[PDB]
Amino acid sequence: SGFRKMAFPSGKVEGCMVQVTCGTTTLNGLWLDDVVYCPRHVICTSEDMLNPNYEDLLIRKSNHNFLVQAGNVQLRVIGHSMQNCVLKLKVDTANPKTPKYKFVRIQPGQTFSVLACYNGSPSGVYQCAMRPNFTIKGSFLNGSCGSVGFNIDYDCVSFCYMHHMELPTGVHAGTDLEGNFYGPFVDRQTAQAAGTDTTITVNVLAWLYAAVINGDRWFLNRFTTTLNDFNLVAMKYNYEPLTQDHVDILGPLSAQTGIAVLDMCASLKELLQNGMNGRTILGSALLEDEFTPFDVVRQCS
Amino acid sequence: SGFRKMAFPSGKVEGCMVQVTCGTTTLNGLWLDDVVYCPRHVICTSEDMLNPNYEDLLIRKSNHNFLVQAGNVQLRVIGHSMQNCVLKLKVDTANPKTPKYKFVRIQPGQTFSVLACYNGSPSGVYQCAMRPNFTIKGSFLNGSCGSVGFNIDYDCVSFCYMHHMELPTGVHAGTDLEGNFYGPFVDRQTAQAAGTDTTITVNVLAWLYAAVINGDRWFLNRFTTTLNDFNLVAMKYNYEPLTQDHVDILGPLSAQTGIAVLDMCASLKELLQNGMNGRTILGSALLEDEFTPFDVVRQCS
Ligand SMILES: O=C(N[C@@H]1CN(C(=O)c2cccn3cncc23)CC[C@H]1c1ccccc1)c1ccc[nH]1
Ligand SMILES: O=C(N[C@@H]1CN(C(=O)c2cccn3cncc23)CC[C@H]1c1ccccc1)c1ccc[nH]1
């Protein structure tokens, strides 16, 4: 028993982290096989940053402008290329610690582990979610660009996030590992801001199932709701719409606990309308939305 | 910016986890050099468990009763010994992945990362604290005994916890790596329960400093308190006494933010007496006590 915010074991990703240096600018890169992947803004000066043309900036670089350090070993760059917002540096040595891996672009609502890194060196691991507004609420300082987010599927690391920037509200924006931003953001200094976020309803429902599995049952009731009447309440409280696909995904947890999805929806409706009244669920005094249905199943059973 | 519950990168500990089997009983062990460390209750049957004499139970075992598996490789046990509540199995192979390491027995209030394991295989990583009552609020299922808790100091892993049991309330009890329980607990099935816990005051104050560093400042006030008058309030709300040593430890954070420790104590006093009034701090609607002063410094700067 017990329920914690739990990251994946980070070892397999630790063995891929490198430092990439271009000039005075230094950040982290991901070394898989003979390629190192990093944010393309490593090639920029402060003057460039207002509106860079990256195609011009990279045209003016040679392989010898890129210093890659793996540990204490300097890796020699033998080719360079840009794919979207990521730079790919080909190196002369394949990483002997390369795990089995995939690159995946995730949907909003999906969770992942972040290995926060500075100068090629892992500092900490944490879980977060891709928010509906395509930011993440991470924990990142100066120097952390190029840190990655991942899930593990047995022995396969599925990389899903590379960190690029911090927005004015203190949340974070970045790309998939093929260099496409999540959201409307661009890799320049401009006026960009996060849009209005929503709560991830299917995840709240999953975590209420986690709570039941762990013995918190106070919020349950004898009532049910229709999906439409639930969705009407959800809209009012700035929650995402619940779909039949979500209802179907919550199937396993419904079966384990004995509580129908739309019966759990009536609990959530009551919690939204009334509050908790000073009580807690799983240690929380607010409704938590960064555990997926899969995360609950993973951890609880 | 941002502030998350953050574990240490777990790689160095992942390379030490093994499965230990004794009969039908299987659990996790920690392989460092040529020794594997695990909970001594691996030698018990269900019948024994009411009140085992472990000295008799181990006297009846040979080396060949212990199967250690590292990955797919079976490691051959060449000696066995008991130290307190841990079994030490000497194996014929030194672990080539052994990190630099220490064993440390921590004080209540200190935090650590847990690598939760099943059958020798890491499943997830999370942070927790040693509570004042000498339990931890972990996340552990059947099969997780022998999972360890640790801190990292540069490249040195300081192991501080080995998991042994779950108490009736769903919290967890275990030992240091020399096999001494934290708390009054014993490794048998008996009527034992967690005592009344308290909130770790110095850690709450650290996290309020984290909040200020990250821009949440709403809870601050123009007031101050004496240490004695603060301690009087702390007692009433079931908080641990704040010492001058704690005040001194909070020095760095006081200096960075400009807020005196006893001025921050007046904020906490006001929060205890009045509540948050529907506001949040760092995403939380309750006061968080599982970040130490060191953890804040680590993460924020
Ligand atoms: O995020 C911005 N700038 C970053 C700042 N930075 C950091 O490593 C960093 C600093 C401070 C907190 N952090 C948290 N994560 C990373 C950082 C170096 C890269 C730079 C950048 C360059 C080209 C394109 C995109 C971002 C920025 C500017 C205006 C709004 N945002
Ligand atoms: O924790 C108890 N028994 C454990 C149960 N167990 C597990 O791996 C485990 C099961 C279920 C949830 N978990 C969470 N962490 C581990 C587990 C095998 C070892 C056993 C044990 C044997 C000798 C001495 C101490 C504990 C127990 C009994 C009465 C109160 N507590």
XYZ file of C-alpha atoms and ligand atoms in Angstrom:
664
model
C 0.000 0.000 0.000
C 0.783 3.695 -0.234
C 0.654 5.952 -3.286
C 3.471 8.277 -4.328
C 4.395 10.373 -7.312
C 6.782 7.892 -8.862
C 9.303 8.299 -11.639
C 10.851 5.594 -13.770
C 14.355 4.392 -12.776
C 16.658 6.760 -14.614
C 19.838 4.669 -15.147
C 19.306 3.898 -18.806
C 18.958 7.594 -19.595
C 21.830 8.625 -17.307
C 24.168 6.600 -19.496
C 23.160 8.726 -22.509
C 23.687 12.230 -21.121
C 26.520 14.364 -22.498
C 27.637 17.953 -22.415
C 27.532 19.866 -25.697
C 29.475 23.111 -25.986
C 29.315 25.615 -28.846
C 31.422 28.635 -28.113
C 30.584 30.124 -24.781
C 27.181 28.360 -24.780
C 26.968 24.988 -23.029
C 23.991 22.652 -22.554
C 23.059 18.969 -22.330
C 22.723 16.450 -25.144
C 21.431 12.910 -25.582
C 23.910 10.385 -27.018
C 22.292 7.385 -28.715
C 24.383 5.224 -31.026
C 26.719 7.588 -32.876
C 24.381 10.627 -32.729
C 24.073 13.367 -30.127
C 20.767 15.246 -30.032
C 20.426 18.705 -28.470
C 18.421 21.980 -28.732
C 19.504 23.950 -31.831
C 19.701 27.189 -29.810
C 23.149 26.065 -28.654
C 24.410 27.777 -31.840
C 23.038 31.187 -30.814
C 24.571 34.210 -29.185
C 22.525 36.632 -27.091
C 22.403 39.066 -30.021
C 20.984 36.414 -32.334
C 18.236 35.477 -29.975
C 15.681 38.126 -30.796
C 14.965 36.495 -34.126
C 17.662 34.057 -35.333
C 17.744 32.532 -38.751
C 19.017 29.137 -37.761
C 19.768 28.034 -41.310
C 22.263 30.915 -41.641
C 23.678 30.317 -38.196
C 24.373 26.660 -38.832
C 25.804 27.327 -42.323
C 28.539 29.314 -40.585
C 29.535 26.478 -38.207
C 32.064 23.708 -38.753
C 32.238 20.343 -36.877
C 35.094 21.747 -34.803
C 32.813 24.417 -33.335
C 31.053 21.633 -31.385
C 32.693 20.149 -28.322
C 30.932 17.052 -26.969
C 32.050 15.719 -23.595
C 30.946 12.359 -22.251
C 32.233 12.119 -18.717
C 35.852 13.113 -18.983
C 36.091 11.787 -22.541
C 35.862 14.256 -25.381
C 33.890 12.879 -28.318
C 34.807 14.002 -31.795
C 32.065 15.410 -33.970
C 32.210 14.244 -37.565
C 28.952 15.651 -38.926
C 26.152 18.094 -38.074
C 22.562 18.536 -39.201
C 19.363 20.305 -38.107
C 15.968 18.573 -37.879
C 13.240 21.023 -36.869
C 14.379 22.578 -33.545
C 17.019 19.958 -32.705
C 20.639 19.787 -33.733
C 22.059 16.323 -34.514
C 25.821 15.910 -34.124
C 27.283 12.727 -35.571
C 30.195 11.510 -33.425
C 32.977 9.019 -34.089
C 32.019 6.681 -31.215
C 28.752 4.833 -30.771
C 27.501 5.030 -27.181
C 28.172 1.589 -25.607
C 25.456 2.245 -23.030
C 22.699 2.909 -25.649
C 19.436 1.270 -24.382
C 16.701 -0.084 -26.581
C 14.816 3.109 -27.477
C 12.021 4.824 -29.376
C 11.111 8.460 -30.019
C 7.408 9.166 -29.383
C 5.370 12.346 -29.593
C 2.863 12.267 -26.720
C -0.670 13.623 -26.322
C -1.703 16.118 -23.631
C -2.582 14.337 -20.435
C 0.232 11.799 -20.732
C 2.853 11.676 -17.996
C 6.624 11.153 -18.175
C 9.768 11.187 -16.027
C 12.308 14.034 -16.434
C 16.002 13.582 -15.758
C 17.163 17.094 -14.952
C 20.801 17.637 -15.986
C 23.511 20.272 -15.757
C 26.712 20.136 -17.829
C 26.011 16.583 -18.938
C 25.585 15.427 -15.340
C 22.204 14.159 -13.947
C 20.967 16.080 -10.933
C 17.506 14.710 -10.150
C 14.492 12.835 -11.442
C 10.816 13.850 -11.222
C 7.416 13.060 -12.833
C 5.336 15.517 -14.741
C 2.541 15.626 -17.320
C 2.071 17.288 -20.669
C -0.542 19.857 -19.711
C -3.566 20.530 -22.021
C -1.933 23.878 -22.894
C 1.264 22.103 -24.036
C 3.526 23.308 -21.248
C 4.966 21.226 -18.414
C 5.254 22.276 -14.805
C 8.856 21.230 -14.360
C 11.771 22.226 -12.189
C 14.565 23.622 -14.279
C 17.366 26.134 -13.809
C 19.830 27.835 -16.108
C 21.871 25.129 -17.801
C 19.139 22.505 -17.963
C 18.316 22.768 -21.700
C 18.594 19.460 -23.406
C 17.370 17.512 -20.379
C 14.912 14.820 -21.544
C 11.609 13.287 -20.576
C 10.844 9.575 -21.008
C 8.741 6.536 -20.260
C 10.016 2.968 -19.964
C 8.245 -0.024 -21.489
C 10.015 -3.088 -20.140
C 13.526 -2.390 -21.332
C 12.648 0.163 -24.026
C 13.102 3.834 -23.284
C 10.519 5.940 -25.107
C 11.880 9.499 -25.236
C 9.145 12.107 -25.486
C 10.466 15.518 -24.393
C 13.573 17.659 -24.774
C 13.725 20.821 -22.694
C 14.171 24.188 -24.498
C 12.799 27.149 -22.514
C 10.988 28.654 -19.535
C 7.902 30.747 -20.122
C 7.033 33.916 -18.075
C 4.770 32.029 -15.667
C 7.596 29.682 -14.664
C 6.355 26.683 -16.634
C 8.409 24.954 -19.329
C 8.270 24.422 -23.089
C 10.123 22.018 -25.305
C 10.048 19.570 -28.172
C 9.722 15.936 -29.054
C 13.069 14.244 -29.915
C 12.538 15.038 -33.611
C 12.560 18.717 -32.678
C 8.904 19.681 -33.034
C 7.555 21.916 -30.243
C 4.656 20.880 -28.145
C 2.236 23.757 -28.459
C 2.564 26.976 -30.518
C 5.956 27.931 -29.098
C 9.088 28.914 -30.967
C 12.761 28.821 -29.973
C 13.386 32.536 -29.852
C 13.018 35.271 -27.294
C 9.582 36.669 -27.967
C 6.402 37.665 -26.143
C 5.005 34.121 -26.010
C 2.959 32.990 -23.028
C 1.150 29.878 -21.905
C -2.528 29.741 -22.759
C -5.275 28.978 -20.235
C -4.848 25.489 -18.855
C -7.493 22.905 -17.897
C -7.549 19.953 -15.477
C -7.067 16.472 -16.921
C -10.332 14.801 -15.953
C -9.534 11.200 -16.843
C -6.440 11.451 -14.659
C -8.414 12.826 -11.690
C -10.753 9.856 -12.029
C -7.798 7.459 -12.149
C -6.400 8.927 -8.948
C -9.770 8.583 -7.220
C -9.591 4.914 -8.149
C -6.097 4.816 -6.625
C -7.542 6.289 -3.470
C -10.204 3.569 -3.266
C -7.586 0.868 -3.881
C -5.687 2.345 -0.908
C -8.694 2.665 1.404
C -9.824 6.300 1.116
C -13.529 5.904 0.413
C -15.122 8.895 2.139
C -15.895 10.740 -1.091
C -17.935 7.908 -2.609
C -21.723 8.177 -2.869
C -24.780 6.193 -3.876
C -25.372 8.331 -6.981
C -24.535 8.207 -10.646
C -24.520 10.670 -13.528
C -24.871 10.620 -17.252
C -21.777 11.399 -19.290
C -23.486 14.502 -20.674
C -24.496 15.822 -17.268
C -21.007 15.143 -15.985
C -19.490 16.958 -18.955
C -21.726 19.933 -18.234
C -20.284 20.191 -14.720
C -16.749 19.590 -15.991
C -17.023 22.546 -18.338
C -18.066 24.851 -15.468
C -15.051 23.903 -13.344
C -12.495 24.180 -16.214
C -12.041 20.401 -16.542
C -11.396 18.664 -19.868
C -14.310 16.776 -21.472
C -14.528 13.109 -20.606
C -14.913 10.899 -23.648
C -16.138 7.350 -24.092
C -12.523 6.443 -24.883
C -11.592 7.671 -21.410
C -14.463 5.699 -19.905
C -13.170 2.611 -21.697
C -9.575 3.246 -20.550
C -10.815 3.410 -16.952
C -12.362 -0.076 -17.441
C -9.696 -2.116 -15.538
C -9.814 0.163 -12.494
C -13.598 0.106 -12.530
C -13.502 -3.692 -12.551
C -10.955 -3.996 -9.742
C -12.781 -1.644 -7.413
C -16.370 -2.468 -8.349
C -17.233 1.188 -8.924
C -18.656 2.100 -12.331
C -16.962 4.994 -14.131
C -20.092 7.104 -14.154
C -20.626 6.344 -10.466
C -17.095 7.688 -9.837
C -18.048 10.676 -11.987
C -20.837 11.413 -9.503
C -18.249 11.472 -6.706
C -16.103 13.903 -8.651
C -19.132 16.056 -9.396
C -19.888 16.202 -5.672
C -16.232 17.047 -4.870
C -16.249 19.846 -7.442
C -19.509 21.257 -6.176
C -18.824 20.988 -2.450
C -15.103 20.749 -1.798
C -13.435 18.263 0.507
C -14.544 19.971 3.725
C -11.121 19.755 5.323
C -10.496 16.130 4.407
C -7.700 14.744 2.254
C -7.394 12.116 -0.455
C -4.104 10.245 -0.672
C -2.483 12.980 1.398
C -3.749 15.737 -0.896
C -6.111 18.596 -0.107
C -6.704 19.142 -3.847
C -7.666 16.912 -6.730
C -4.554 15.526 -8.422
C -4.405 15.212 -12.228
C -0.849 14.020 -13.049
C -1.416 10.255 -12.693
C -2.710 8.490 -15.796
C -4.846 5.294 -15.634
C -1.739 3.362 -16.631
C 0.298 4.971 -13.862
C -2.270 3.894 -11.297
C -2.361 0.320 -12.552
C 1.450 0.264 -12.617
C 1.878 1.419 -9.071
C -1.085 -0.115 -7.270
C -0.950 -3.662 -8.580
C 12.069 28.011 -11.674
C 9.525 25.462 -10.511
C 9.669 23.196 -7.467
C 9.031 19.453 -7.574
C 9.440 16.489 -5.294
C 12.716 15.285 -6.732
C 14.569 12.032 -6.262
C 18.229 11.346 -6.881
C 19.146 9.672 -10.207
C 18.879 5.980 -9.444
C 21.365 4.384 -11.901
C 24.130 3.701 -9.421
C 21.732 1.792 -7.183
C 20.028 0.001 -10.086
C 23.343 -1.654 -10.880
C 23.410 -3.166 -7.370
C 19.961 -4.769 -7.217
C 19.679 -8.563 -7.186
C 17.079 -11.187 -6.486
C 17.633 -13.393 -3.442
C 15.671 -16.625 -3.142
C 15.502 -18.915 -0.109
C 13.106 -21.747 -0.689
C 9.755 -20.510 -1.811
C 10.508 -17.021 -0.413
C 11.963 -14.457 -2.820
C 12.933 -10.816 -2.235
C 15.448 -8.163 -3.295
C 19.060 -7.775 -2.211
C 21.813 -5.186 -2.543
C 25.069 -6.392 -4.132
C 28.131 -4.333 -3.198
C 31.583 -5.779 -3.812
C 31.332 -9.500 -3.062
C 28.507 -9.179 -0.485
C 24.744 -9.270 -0.939
C 22.669 -7.648 1.806
C 18.996 -8.494 2.362
C 16.303 -8.712 5.104
C 16.908 -11.780 7.311
C 13.213 -12.742 7.137
C 13.959 -14.348 3.767
C 14.846 -17.457 5.820
C 11.361 -17.708 7.357
C 8.308 -19.742 6.529
C 4.799 -18.548 7.367
C 4.734 -20.860 10.396
C 7.947 -19.376 11.762
C 6.720 -15.852 11.501
C 4.756 -15.560 14.706
C 7.943 -15.537 16.733
C 11.028 -16.862 14.889
C 14.328 -17.538 16.522
C 16.533 -16.406 13.696
C 19.709 -17.859 15.173
C 18.149 -21.347 15.011
C 16.717 -20.739 11.575
C 20.029 -19.690 10.096
C 21.935 -22.528 11.827
C 19.817 -24.917 9.763
C 20.685 -23.294 6.401
C 23.585 -24.057 4.083
C 25.025 -21.742 1.354
C 23.166 -23.795 -1.245
C 19.814 -22.799 0.259
C 20.425 -19.268 -1.085
C 19.948 -18.540 -4.761
C 21.169 -15.092 -5.829
C 20.292 -13.915 -9.331
C 21.835 -10.842 -10.907
C 20.052 -10.279 -14.179
C 20.091 -13.653 -15.843
C 23.353 -14.606 -14.133
C 23.186 -16.816 -11.083
C 25.715 -15.802 -8.440
C 27.173 -18.470 -6.216
C 26.964 -17.959 -2.485
C 30.111 -18.935 -0.626
C 29.308 -17.699 2.878
C 26.421 -16.442 5.026
C 26.154 -14.373 8.189
C 23.562 -12.374 10.151
C 24.151 -8.815 11.404
C 21.173 -7.552 13.404
C 18.122 -7.863 11.089
C 20.068 -8.227 7.830
C 21.470 -11.324 6.207
C 24.852 -10.985 4.455
C 25.584 -13.498 1.693
C 29.172 -13.600 0.475
C 29.282 -14.350 -3.266
C 32.085 -15.493 -5.549
C 31.923 -12.427 -7.832
C 32.490 -8.821 -6.850
C 29.894 -6.515 -8.411
C 31.667 -4.664 -11.274
C 29.091 -1.876 -11.059
C 29.724 -1.159 -7.319
C 29.620 2.671 -6.810
C 31.541 4.555 -4.181
C 29.324 4.032 -1.121
C 28.701 4.541 2.582
C 26.160 3.151 5.047
C 24.577 5.885 7.200
C 21.919 5.761 9.888
C 19.759 8.877 9.478
C 17.856 11.059 11.948
C 14.098 11.681 11.785
C 13.324 14.537 9.461
C 15.942 13.541 6.892
C 14.799 12.702 3.376
C 15.971 10.009 0.947
C 15.163 8.455 -2.433
C 13.683 4.918 -2.585
C 14.256 2.592 -5.514
C 11.274 0.266 -5.359
C 12.137 -3.206 -6.700
C 10.454 -6.510 -7.472
C 12.404 -9.726 -8.117
C 15.686 -7.852 -8.370
C 14.265 -5.494 -10.993
C 13.778 -1.710 -10.346
C 10.224 -0.512 -10.831
C 10.180 3.139 -9.764
C 11.886 5.864 -7.783
C 10.330 8.255 -5.242
C 11.338 10.601 -2.368
C 10.278 10.187 1.196
C 11.305 11.230 4.709
C 12.028 9.403 7.925
C 9.011 10.497 9.937
C 9.399 11.538 13.638
C 7.667 8.256 14.563
C 10.292 6.242 12.633
C 8.038 5.032 9.841
C 8.125 6.120 6.201
C 5.135 6.829 4.018
C 6.289 4.779 1.063
C 4.692 2.926 -1.803
C 5.409 -0.756 -1.567
C 3.688 -3.970 -2.606
C 4.244 -7.637 -1.900
C 7.721 -8.521 -3.119
C 9.349 -5.178 -2.375
C 11.321 -6.190 0.755
C 14.958 -5.428 0.396
C 14.356 -2.292 -1.668
C 16.706 0.469 -0.445
C 16.700 4.155 0.332
C 19.672 6.432 -0.400
C 21.165 9.868 -0.826
C 23.933 10.805 -3.255
C 26.856 13.047 -2.339
C 28.673 13.777 -5.581
C 29.493 10.260 -6.674
C 29.058 8.562 -3.287
C 25.870 6.670 -2.586
C 24.938 6.852 1.092
C 22.534 3.971 1.770
C 20.216 4.651 4.687
C 17.160 2.369 4.510
C 16.304 -1.236 3.703
C 12.623 -2.101 3.485
C 11.245 -4.862 5.781
C 7.510 -4.500 6.492
C 4.194 -2.669 6.219
C 2.417 -1.597 9.372
C -1.428 -1.699 9.812
C -1.875 1.952 8.834
C -0.206 1.375 5.460
C 3.092 3.035 6.344
C 6.444 1.245 6.186
C 9.158 0.102 8.587
C 12.696 -1.002 7.959
C 16.332 -0.872 8.946
C 19.601 0.847 8.275
C 22.015 -1.210 6.096
C 23.607 -2.694 9.232
C 20.219 -4.183 10.076
C 19.062 -2.015 12.971
C 15.386 -0.980 12.832
C 14.369 2.604 12.800
C 11.941 2.883 15.673
C 10.813 0.184 18.154
C 9.796 -2.317 15.481
C 10.752 -5.960 15.193
C 10.849 -8.321 12.208
C 8.043 -10.616 13.239
C 4.301 -10.676 12.850
C 3.047 -9.023 15.997
C 0.598 -6.355 17.144
C 2.981 -3.453 16.491
C 1.639 -0.117 15.297
C 3.005 3.284 14.408
C 2.996 5.820 17.208
C 1.533 9.322 16.905
C 3.420 11.306 14.304
C 4.338 15.013 14.257
C 5.086 17.515 11.472
C 8.727 18.312 10.740
C 8.833 22.040 11.439
C 12.279 22.879 10.090
C 11.274 21.269 6.803
C 8.036 23.285 6.585
C 10.108 26.429 7.064
C 12.532 25.325 4.345
C 9.670 24.810 1.917
C 8.271 28.258 2.706
C 11.684 29.589 1.739
C 11.426 27.581 -1.492
C 8.090 29.220 -2.124
C 9.577 32.704 -1.709
C 12.483 31.810 -4.008
C 9.842 30.816 -6.590
C 7.638 33.887 -6.151
C 4.839 32.810 -3.790
C 4.929 35.557 -1.179
C 1.291 35.970 -0.146
C 1.749 34.331 3.252
C 4.498 36.701 4.395
C 3.791 39.358 7.027
C 5.397 42.287 8.800
C 5.584 40.412 12.118
C 8.098 38.355 14.015
C 8.004 35.944 16.939
C 10.289 34.734 19.642
C 11.500 31.154 19.409
C 9.686 30.344 22.652
C 6.388 31.827 21.519
C 6.722 30.018 18.218
C 7.441 26.748 20.008
C 4.328 27.255 22.109
C 2.204 27.440 18.956
C 4.071 24.526 17.376
C 3.218 22.303 20.318
C -0.508 23.101 19.964
C -0.571 22.129 16.284
C 1.444 18.877 16.741
C 4.616 20.295 15.155
C 8.121 19.333 16.292
C 10.048 21.863 18.415
C 12.278 24.220 16.488
C 15.787 24.397 17.882
C 18.562 26.938 17.508
C 20.379 24.310 15.432
C 17.449 24.383 13.014
C 17.520 28.176 12.986
C 21.220 28.016 12.144
C 20.653 25.410 9.399
C 18.079 27.728 7.814
C 20.777 30.465 7.695
C 21.624 30.219 3.939
C 17.973 30.393 2.883
C 17.376 33.301 5.231
C 20.310 35.126 3.653
C 19.247 34.465 0.061
C 15.685 35.619 0.576
C 16.267 38.401 3.099
C 13.677 36.992 5.496
C 14.842 36.247 9.038
C 14.042 32.771 10.367
C 11.894 34.096 13.175
C 10.096 36.374 10.718
C 9.295 33.253 8.648
C 8.177 31.613 11.891
C 5.585 34.378 12.247
C 4.259 33.497 8.784
C 3.982 29.850 9.743
C 2.266 30.785 12.992
C -0.287 32.792 11.013
C -0.790 29.896 8.547
C -1.339 27.464 11.418
C -3.774 29.760 13.157
C -5.759 30.875 10.117
C -5.329 28.413 7.275
C -4.564 29.316 3.686
C -8.061 30.604 2.899
C -8.287 28.740 -0.386
C -4.837 29.713 -1.620
C -1.953 27.403 -2.465
C 1.791 27.395 -1.893
C 3.932 25.732 -4.542
C 0.841 23.954 -5.837
C -0.067 22.611 -2.396
C -3.155 23.300 -0.308
C -1.358 21.970 2.797
C 1.966 22.662 4.432
C 4.621 20.296 3.082
C 7.247 18.804 5.423
C 9.291 16.352 3.290
C 11.849 18.821 1.883
C 14.897 19.445 4.060
C 16.866 22.749 3.986
C 19.506 20.941 1.950
C 16.915 19.692 -0.526
C 15.698 23.232 -1.094
C 19.194 24.591 -1.636
C 19.945 21.679 -3.977
C 16.937 22.202 -6.163
C 16.474 25.965 -6.156
C 20.023 27.115 -6.790
O 13.875 30.335 -21.494
C 14.368 31.375 -21.939
N 15.651 31.489 -22.281
C 16.598 30.396 -22.145
C 17.379 30.588 -20.821
N 18.345 29.495 -20.697
C 18.299 28.567 -19.700
O 19.007 27.558 -19.682
C 17.347 28.836 -18.567
C 17.426 30.012 -17.837
C 16.560 30.230 -16.736
C 15.631 29.278 -16.388
N 15.551 28.136 -17.122
C 14.710 27.067 -16.982
N 14.932 26.139 -17.925
C 16.000 26.635 -18.679
C 16.381 27.863 -18.211
C 19.316 29.378 -21.797
C 18.583 29.206 -23.139
C 17.550 30.319 -23.373
C 16.890 30.126 -24.739
C 17.606 30.450 -25.905
C 17.022 30.249 -27.166
C 15.719 29.742 -27.274
C 14.998 29.418 -26.119
C 15.581 29.602 -24.848
C 13.558 32.584 -22.124
C 13.859 33.838 -22.592
C 12.650 34.610 -22.545
C 11.658 33.797 -22.052
N 12.230 32.575 -21.799
O 4.629 -6.511 6.424
C 4.196 -7.591 6.838
N 4.546 -8.767 6.318
C 5.463 -8.887 5.198
C 4.633 -9.047 3.901
N 5.560 -9.186 2.777
C 5.643 -8.282 1.760
O 6.528 -8.310 0.903
C 4.568 -7.233 1.697
C 3.231 -7.589 1.632
C 2.230 -6.592 1.516
C 2.579 -5.263 1.474
N 3.893 -4.924 1.556
C 4.477 -3.687 1.552
N 5.810 -3.772 1.674
C 6.086 -5.142 1.720
C 4.923 -5.861 1.664
C 6.502 -10.314 2.868
C 7.337 -10.208 4.156
C 6.450 -10.073 5.403
C 7.330 -10.022 6.654
C 7.930 -11.203 7.125
C 8.763 -11.163 8.254
C 8.990 -9.956 8.931
C 8.395 -8.776 8.470
C 7.568 -8.801 7.327
C 3.245 -7.653 7.952
C 2.628 -8.702 8.587
C 1.797 -8.146 9.616
C 1.939 -6.780 9.572
N 2.817 -6.502 8.554
